[PDB]
Design a protein around this ligand. Structure first.
Ligand code: A1BE9
Length: 185
């Protein structure tokens, strides 16, 4: 890929975060806490899962950012509609307004319905996410493997503004406490 030059400065939106998440002062890192984080509930917060949105909203153009996933056992990354459901149980699918990939139990999968197996030779420590609003494209790149393509969603029906989407995953095992981190330009 040569997509680096549509780089956008993403920050996390505290108000959308699950109440157990801890967002750094610079709003560039998020991790699971060991308890509820002493914040009020609001209609924006994801209730059931350790999810948060980016502050940025996109309705046009080309956007690129990178996320560090070092030493995590489980995570979800991509983009979603601003209008996605926040409360209760739901699946990550384009029909529900999500364009995502994940790591779960040593397998990488794209969030189609049903989910699609990914073929990654070099487990990634850093993921690049590229959105072309007009083209209807969301692509994922393996930064650890010289930017090799992971997966492309095409003919996407965004149907409104998009937000960067993050899930740090649960930490039942004790091996998934590490943060997601937005990487510098
Ligand atoms: C009581 C309850 O249902 N939970 C507590 C904890 C672990 C599972 C679930 C949950 C969802 C989101 C964030 C934190 C949690």
């Amino acid at each position: 890929h040569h997509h680096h030059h549509h780089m956008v400065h993403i920050t996390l939106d505290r108000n959308t975060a699950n109440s157990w998440l801890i967002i750094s002062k610079d709003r560039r890192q998020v991790r699971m806490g060991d308890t509820h984080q002493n914040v009020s509930d609001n209609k924006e917060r994801f209730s059931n899962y350790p999810m948060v949105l980016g502050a940025q909203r996109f309705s046009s153009g080309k956007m690129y950012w990178e996320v560090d996933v070092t030493q995590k056992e489980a995570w979800d990354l991509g983009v979603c509609r601003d209008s996605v459901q926040r409360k209760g149980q739901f699946s990550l699918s384009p029909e529900n307004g999500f364009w995502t990939i994940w790591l779960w139990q040593d397998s990488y999968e794209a969030g189609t319905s049903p989910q699609t197996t990914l073929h990654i030779q070099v487990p990634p420590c850093q993921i690049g996410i590229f959105v072309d609003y007009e083209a209807g494209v969301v692509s994922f790149y393996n930064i650890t493997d010289h930017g090799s393509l992971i997966y492309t969603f095409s003919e996407c029906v965004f149907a409104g503004p998009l937000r960067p989407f993050f899930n740090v995953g649960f930490n039942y095992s004790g091996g998934n406490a590490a943060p997601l981190k937005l990487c510098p330009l």
